[PDB]
Amino acid sequence: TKDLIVIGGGINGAGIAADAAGRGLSVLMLEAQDLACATSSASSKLIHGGLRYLEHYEFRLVSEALAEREVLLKMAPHIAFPMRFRLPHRPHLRPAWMIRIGLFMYDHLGKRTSLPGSTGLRFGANSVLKPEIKRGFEYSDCWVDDARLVLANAQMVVRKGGEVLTRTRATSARRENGLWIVEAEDIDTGKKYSWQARGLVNATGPWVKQFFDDGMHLPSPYGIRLIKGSHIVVPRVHTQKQAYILQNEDKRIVFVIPWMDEFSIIGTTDVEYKGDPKAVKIEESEINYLLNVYNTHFKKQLSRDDIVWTYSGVRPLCDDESDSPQAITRDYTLDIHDENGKAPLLSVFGGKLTTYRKLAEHALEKLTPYYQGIGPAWTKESVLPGGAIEGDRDDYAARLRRRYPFLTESLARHYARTYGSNSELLLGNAGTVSDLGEDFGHEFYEAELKYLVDHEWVRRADDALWRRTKQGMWLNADQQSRVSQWLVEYTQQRLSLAS
Ligand SMILES: Cc1cc2nc3c(=O)[nH]c(=O)nc-3n(C[C@H](O)[C@H](O)[C@H](O)COP(=O)(O)OP(=O)(O)OC[C@H]3O[C@@H](n4cnc5c(N)ncnc54)[C@H](O)[C@@H]3O)c2cc1C
Ligand SMILES: CCCCCCCCO[C@@H]1O[C@H](CO)[C@@H](O)[C@H](O)[C@H]1O
Ligand SMILES: CCCCCCCCO[C@@H]1O[C@H](CO)[C@@H](O)[C@H](O)[C@H]1O
Ligand SMILES: CCCCCCCCO[C@@H]1O[C@H](CO)[C@@H](O)[C@H](O)[C@H]1O
Ligand SMILES: CCCCCCCCO[C@@H]1O[C@H](CO)[C@@H](O)[C@H](O)[C@H]1O
């Protein structure tokens, strides 16, 4: 009998499970495929506040999101850091005066302790923008490695004594005799599981209503508005460290975000989507849309041929019945119901990456009446697994290379920005490059891949190359198939057992 079972291992499920485990609940988190396999790896990777939501009057959300930025930067310094954003002025769309106030709200809605001011810009004949654009504005927000933020939370669950199972799909949940009985199946081996729990969380993202309908045969409190958004990736469009936020002719904004020193991400789009969330992928008109708003602003033109990767996901969004996808609220709603005072179901509707910690604390607040002697709120003071450094650059990578002098500058940078304070567990007793074992390409060594399987739930090559890391951007097809082969070998046995 678990205290709490959480179904879903995106950001919301992992954040709720972690918060619960740290309040002394016995927790089990179930993830059908891999941690952050769906929406929580398909985001624009921003911890924001949501500048564009001010136009819609979403103060509560914007204020919350803005003040969380500083909390999240402290919790996960290895994977989250400040970024500057440049907004080119387009007075036919929004007048300078409106922007020159919008910016002060964004500055004093949360109360920031550390993120720099906000400034005007002028653009000259030599800038990266087309000459007709002569003015803009620059303000602070944060970038975060979305999929590794979910991983850090799953690690926290385990640290606090909780249990995490991936490749394990919950197939039903029903209330019997005052308890939940939850059934689940291993997606590979068909192994069936059944647990009892005192309380159940439905944090299944795009599937949240479907799990009501198919898993539980209970009425969903809300409908869900699956709104697809896609991103494109190109070799970095300029050498500047700032992101740009572009005002499009439809009133939407599109970002151009530096990524991994080598690339730029451009996105995103707002497309009503119907069908299987697993099948989501970018469409031609999204490519045309994103290249347009980029090419209208920047001198250096991009074509379809420059794109080197794309990705796509579906925002679950609580259905507030808005006619326009870009206007549907991005704020979350939690619903909780019990039967005869027992066996609460808490279901998550919406919930940006940015607000996950607050969402989780709110969830546990709602769950509290059901758990005698449950611990208090705690995560605001916590440091997630990997976060116990002190400046990423900065000097953690410098500090690493000082301890482990066989590390290249590039590899030390990768470990600091990926594993953070867990780098020493990865590197174990290594004292040369050869101690890292097989080189799979782009300084992705056996020591790393083994660590990922042992400590980061990696089961398949995509887990390691696209969620745990983004080494998939560099490894060729042959190298990616060798990673898959190594995993089959390592995970099939000699460590998976018969002891
Ligand atoms: C295009 C795009 C860009 C975005 N950009 C940002 C941004 O810049 N900043 C920000 O803060 N937010 C952003 N978001 C929003 C954010 O990504 C999502 O709100 C967040 O990822 C929601 O995650 P979730 O945990 O609720 O859903 P998920 O955890 O992603 O989905 C449910 C997960 O649980 C598992 N699961 C589902 N059903 C079952 C079941 N039956 N049994 C067992 N397991 C199951 C799945 O495999 C799935 O991965 C963006 C969203 C989109 C779509
Ligand atoms: C009647 C409502 C008018 C006031 C609108 C609130 C101003 C904030 O509005 C925001 O301003 C930003 C720049 O600061 C823009 O980039 C965003 O797209 C816009 O949503
Ligand atoms: C002159 C327009 C060139 C486009 C580059 C941005 C400079 C716009 O500068 C001006 O901003 C003011 C308030 O919005 C107003 O004087 C005008 O609407 C606008 O032209
Ligand atoms: C610093 C913001 C003060 C708050 C009041 C906003 C008034 C808008 O200040 C802006 O100044 C520009 C000249 O620099 C003009 O081009 C714009 O027309 C004007 O609206
Ligand atoms: C006295 C200080 C002014 C505060 C700004 C109040 C916000 C509403 O301001 C109004 O918004 C309209 C719709 O966007 C605009 O068309 C109007 O020009 C503007 O005056």
Q: Please give the Cα distance from 264 to 455 (Å, whole number).
A: 30
Beta bridge partners of 196: 181
Residues with Cβ within 8 Å of residue 168, at least 6 apart in sequence? 30, 31, 32, 184, 185, 186, 187, 193
Residues with Cβ within 8 Å of residue 288, at least 6 apart in sequence? none
Phi-psi region of 34 (alpha: psi -120 to 50; beta: other; left: phi over 0): beta
In this structure, the answer to whether residues 425 and 473 fall within a common structural domain is no
φ, ψ at 454 (rounded to 5°): -70, -35
Q: 36: CA distance to ligand 4 center in Å?
A: 43
Q: Which two tokens stand for residue 64?
A: 């919350």
In this structure, the answer to whether residues 75 and 152 fall within a common structural domain is yes
Measuring from atom 6 of ligand 4, which residue has the nearest CA? 97
Q: Of how many residues is the chain composed?
A: 499
Q: Which two tokens stand for residue 38?
A: 């769906």
Boundary of a domain, candidates 331, 353, 388: 388
In this structure, the answer to whether residues 75 and 150 fall within a common structural domain is yes
Beta bridge partners of 227: 272, 315
To the question of whether residue 144 is assigned a binding role by annotation, the answer is: no
Q: Please give the Cα distance from 396 to 411 (Å, whole number).
A: 12
Q: What is the CATH number of the domain that holds 404?
A: 1.10.8.870
Q: Please give the Cα distance from 370 to 267 (Å, whole number).
A: 42
- The experimental method behind these coordinates is X-ray
Beta bridge partners of 445: 439
Q: 120: CA distance to ligand 4 center in Å?
A: 11
To the question of whether residue 49 is assigned a binding role by annotation, the answer is: no
Q: Max Cα separation, the chain?
A: 74
Q: Among residues 289, 256, 284, which one has the least CA distance to residue 270?
A: 289
Residue 88 Cα: closest atom of ligand 3: 6
Half-sphere exposure of 149 (CA within 13 A, CB side): 32
Boundary of a domain, candidates 318, 334, 353: 318
Q: What is the CATH number of the domain that holds 305?
A: 3.30.9.10
- Find the helix packing angle between 11-21 and 356-367, rounded to 10°: 50
Half-sphere exposure of 424 (CA within 13 A, CB side): 11
How far is residue 345 from each of residues 199, 223, 331, measured CA to CA in Å?
A: 6, 17, 20
To the question of whether residue 271 is assigned a binding role by annotation, the answer is: no
CA 430 centroid distance within chain: 31
Sign of the four-CA dihedral 16, 20, 25, 28: positive
Boundary of a domain, candidates 388, 418, 436: 388
Q: Please give the Cα distance from 290 to 450 (Å, whole number).
A: 38
Residues with Cβ within 8 Å of residue 275, at least 6 apart in sequence? none
Phi-psi region of 317 (alpha: psi -120 to 50; beta: other; left: phi over 0): left
* Distance between start and end Cα atoms, the chain: 26
Measuring from atom 2 of ligand 3, which residue has the nearest CA? 91
In this structure, the answer to whether residues 218 and 358 fall within a common structural domain is yes
Q: Are 252 and 289 in contact (CB under 8 A)?
A: no
In this structure, the answer to whether residues 229 and 308 fall within a common structural domain is yes
Q: 89: CA distance to ligand 2 center in Å?
A: 13
Beta bridge partners of 231: 267, 311
One-letter amino acid of 379: T
In this structure, the answer to whether residues 37 and 134 fall within a common structural domain is no
Q: 252: CA distance to ligand 4 center in Å?
A: 23
Measuring from atom 2 of ligand 1, which residue has the nearest CA? 43
In this structure, the answer to whether residues 67 and 192 fall within a common structural domain is yes
Q: 286: CA distance to ligand 3 center in Å?
A: 29
φ, ψ at 480 (rounded to 5°): -70, -35
Mutate to test the pocket of ligand 2, among 46, 48, 52 (most ligand atoms within 8 A of CB): 52
* Resolution in angstrom units: 1.8
Q: Please give the Cα distance from 416 to 135 (Å, whole number).
A: 37
- Ligand number nearest CA of 120 is 4
Half-sphere exposure of 127 (CA within 13 A, CB side): 17
Q: What is the CATH number of the domain that holds 355?
A: 3.50.50.60
In this structure, the answer to whether residues 151 and 11 fall within a common structural domain is yes
Q: Are 162 and 169 in contact (CB under 8 A)?
A: no
Q: 51: CA distance to ligand 2 center in Å?
A: 7
In this structure, the answer to whether residues 131 and 279 fall within a common structural domain is yes
**Which residue matches tokens 């990423």?**
392
In this structure, the answer to whether residues 313 and 419 fall within a common structural domain is no
In this structure, the answer to whether residues 228 and 344 fall within a common structural domain is no
**What string of H, E and C letters represents the secondary structure of the chain?**
CEEEEEECCCHHHHHHHHHHHCCCCCEEEECCCCCCCCHHHCCCCEECCCHHHHHHCCHHHHHHHHHHHHHHHHHCCCCEEEEEEEEECCCCCCCHHHHHHHHHHCCCCCCCCCCCCCEEEECCCCCCECCCCCEEEEEEEEEECHHHHHHHHHHHHHHCCCEEECCEEEEEEEEECCEEEEEEEECCCCCEEEEEEEEEEECCHHHHHHHHHHHHCCCCCCCECCEEEEEEEEECCCCCCCEEEEECCCCCEEEEEEECCCEEEEECCCEECCCCHHHCCCCHHHHHHHHHHHHHHECCCCCHHHCCEEEEEEECCECCCCCCHHHCCCCCEEEEEEECCEEEEEEEECCCHHHHHHHHHHHHHHHHHHCCCCCCCCHHHCCCCCCCCCCCECCHHHHHHHHCCCCCHHHHHHHHHHCHHHHHHHHCCCCCCHHHCCECCCCCEHHHHHHHHHHCCCCCHHHHHHHHCCHHHCCCHHHHHHHHHHHHHHHHCCCCCCC
Residues with Cβ within 8 Å of residue 471, at least 6 apart in sequence? 441, 442, 444, 464, 465
Ligand 2 contacts (CB < 6 A) are 51-52, 54-55, 87, 94, 98-99, 102-103, 253
In this structure, the answer to whether residues 308 and 254 fall within a common structural domain is yes
Q: b/e for 10-33, b at 16 or more Cβ within 10 A?
A: bbbbbbbbbbbbbbebbbbbbbbb
Per the structure, the complete domain to which residue 432 belongs is given by 389-459
For strands 135-144 and 119-122, give the pairing.
antiparallel
One-letter amino acid of 413: R
Domain count, the chain: 4
Q: What is the CATH number of the domain that holds 486?
A: 6.10.250.1890
Q: Among residues 41, 32, 45, 33, which one has the least CA distance to residue 11?
A: 41
